[PDB]
Amino acid sequence: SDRRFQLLAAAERLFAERGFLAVRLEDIGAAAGVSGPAIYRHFPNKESLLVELLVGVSARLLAGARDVTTRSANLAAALDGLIEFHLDFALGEADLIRIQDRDLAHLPAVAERQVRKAQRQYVEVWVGVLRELNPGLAEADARLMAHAVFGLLNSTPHSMKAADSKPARTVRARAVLRAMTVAALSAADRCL
Amino acid sequence: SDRRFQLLAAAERLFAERGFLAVRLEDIGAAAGVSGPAIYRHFPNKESLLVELLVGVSARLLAGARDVTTRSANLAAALDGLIEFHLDFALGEADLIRIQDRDLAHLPAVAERQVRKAQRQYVEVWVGVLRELNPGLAEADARLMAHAVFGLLNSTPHSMKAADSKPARTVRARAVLRAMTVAALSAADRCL
DNA sequence: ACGTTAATGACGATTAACCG
DNA sequence: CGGTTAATCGTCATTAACGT
């Protein structure tokens, strides 16, 4: 199915730009070629597109984070790897980031709990690394630091709608956001 | 007495929690203690509630930022004041932050341009202070740093839904997020 | 003013009725 | 299999039509 992939990619782009509710199934159909309710030959309803997109990305993030900590010999290398991983993600899959923290509530209850579980576990991987690096760090403080870092890195979605970010933009942004993130986590640590 | 204010405060809470489109006038009426499309005796349509909320907050933020830079003797004091101001906003008016960067697209075109103007000008205030502190800093890098800081500070809206909001939580979060922000901006600066 | 309860009218997700 | 186009059917914002 290259129509199945074409619909999901159209849905991803349109949900990011316009939001879930304001996107008309016919618009997704149209953008993929064929449309109105051709969609139902691939999917059983709107919601199922959103579910595939968000269950997919939330599972990928958790698996990728675990892979990073698995391969890392030491906790400093693990943190560096998690930053790199999430930075690649934030720069590369901005649309799925924007959908995940704008449209989570529009999931069927079952799917919503599955995505919240994968997200909670992704935060816990970061919290686990930060607390092992600083045994004096309270759970609550580690969580706050983690969310703050995701916010810092996910600030290209908020400064990038459909802009350049090919040449010096990609490499420059990566350098600056990594430096900001590394310094942020060091200062949090020396206050706490 | 304050029926207009009661509707806006209900609309602010519900738009933040459920998003603009999924909120029914009747839900806002209900919560304000005034069933139904009574709303039309105060406002000419849904959209006008969203417009008042977002034109209001975007104008406030710009005015507040200008006030901070006006009163500050030195650029270090100005940056500290802008951080404090935005931190107070992020901790205190989380609902309006969430609505502004989730539901901007659902404004009438005129209102959307007014809010984007006030947002652009608010970013420019931060950019002005950062470039005067570091004349070697390019415009593009200052903007990236500004957006990164807003992202970092607006990470309590994403970790806090009507939670606490208590003594130690407010003051603790403020301390930690300020330390992260100050360190982030110092490290960005010494890379650039 | 303000509010209440019935229309009205769109719009948009499913679904039915028909082809390869 | 996928697709099509013309019904349904619910759900709202918005208006009417009536009291305050």
**Cβ neighbourhood burial of A41 (10 Å; 0-12, 13-18, 19+):** exposed
DSSP states along A136-187:
T--HHHHHHHHHHHHHHHTHHHHH-SS---SSHHHHHHHHHHHHHHHHHHHH
Phi, psi values for residue A42, rounded to 5°: -110, -35
Q: CA-CA distance, A72 to A79, in Å (whole number)? A: 9
Nearest CA in chain A to B143: A159
Omega before residue B165 within 30° of 0, cis: yes
Q: Which of A19, A154, A192 shows the shortest C-beta gap to B151?
A: A154
User: Cβ A105–B18 below 8 Å, yes or no?
Assistant: yes
Task: From residue B41, give the alpha-carbon distance in Å to each of A6, B35, B134.
Answer: 47, 12, 53
- List all residues 6 or more positions away from A180 whose beta carbon is below 8 Å from its beta carbon: A152, B145, B148, B184, B185, B187, B188
Experimental method: X-ray
The total of other beta-carbon atoms located within 10 Å of residue B171's CB is 11
Q: CA-CA distance, B187 to A83, in Å (whole number)? A: 16
- Judging contacts by C-beta atoms under 8 Å, the chain B residues touching residue A179 are 187-188, 191
On whether the CB atoms of residues B137 and B186 are closer than 8 A, the answer is no
Residue A20 DSSP label: S
Angle between helices A139-153 and A75-92 (to 10 degrees): 40
How far is C-alpha B133 from the geometric centre of its chain's CA atoms?
Answer: 24
Phi, psi values for residue B12, rounded to 5°: -55, -50
Query: With a 7 Å cutoff on the CB, does B38 touch strand C?
Result: yes
On whether the CB atoms of residues A168 and A160 are closer than 8 A, the answer is no
On whether the CB atoms of residues B146 and B128 are closer than 8 A, the answer is no
Helix (H, G, I), strand (E, B) or coil at B22: coil
Q: CA-CA distance, A61 to A78, in Å (whole number)? A: 15
On whether the CB atoms of residues B81 and B68 are closer than 8 A, the answer is yes
Q: Which residue is nearest to nucleotide C14 (CA to C1')?
A: A45
Query: With a 7 Å cutoff on the CB, does B30 touch strand C?
Result: no
On whether the CB atoms of residues A157 and B142 are closer than 8 A, the answer is no
**Cβ neighbourhood burial of A64 (10 Å; 0-12, 13-18, 19+):** middle
Q: Which of B105, B158, B177 shows the shortest C-beta gap to A19?
A: B105
Q: CA-CA distance, A95 to A23, in Å (whole number)? A: 15
Q: CA-CA distance, B155 to B157, in Å (whole number)? A: 6
For residue B154, give the nearest of B100, B76, B81 by alpha carbon. Answer: B100
Q: What angle do CA A147, A155, B84 make, to 5 degrees?
A: 70
Documented resolution in Å? 3.2
User: Cβ A154–B154 below 8 Å, yes or no?
Assistant: no
Q: CA-CA distance, B18 to A23, in Å (whole number)? A: 17
- Judging contacts by C-beta atoms under 8 Å, the chain A residues touching residue B184 are 152, 180-181, 183-184, 187
Task: From residue B145, give the alpha-carbon distance in Å to each of A25, A148, A159, B133, B174.
Answer: 38, 14, 10, 13, 19
Helix (H, G, I), strand (E, B) or coil at B104: helix
Residue B154 DSSP label: T
- List all residues 6 or more positions away from B80 whose beta carbon is below 8 Å from its beta carbon: none
Q: CA-CA distance, B49 to B95, in Å (whole number)? A: 14
Distance (Å) from CA B163 to C1' D6?
Answer: 50
Query: With a 7 Å cutoff on the CB, does A23 touch strand C?
Result: yes
The total of other beta-carbon atoms located within 10 Å of residue A126's CB is 24
On whether the CB atoms of residues B154 and B87 are closer than 8 A, the answer is no
Strand D nucleotides below 7 A of a protein CB? 1-6, 12-16
- List all residues 6 or more positions away from B157 whose beta carbon is below 8 Å from its beta carbon: B90, B94, B97, B98
How far is C-alpha A47 from the geometric centre of its chain's CA atoms?
Answer: 19
Alpha helices in chain B (DSSP H): 3-18, 25-32, 46-71, 75-92, 94-100, 109-133, 139-153, 155-159, 167-189
Q: CA-CA distance, A149 to B91, in Å (whole number)? A: 17
DSSP states along A22-43:
T--HHHHHHHHSS-GGGGGGT-
Task: From residue A45, give the alpha-carbon distance in Å to each of A27, A41, B26.
Answer: 14, 10, 27
The answer to whether the Cα torsion of A99, B95, A109, A120 is positive or negative is positive
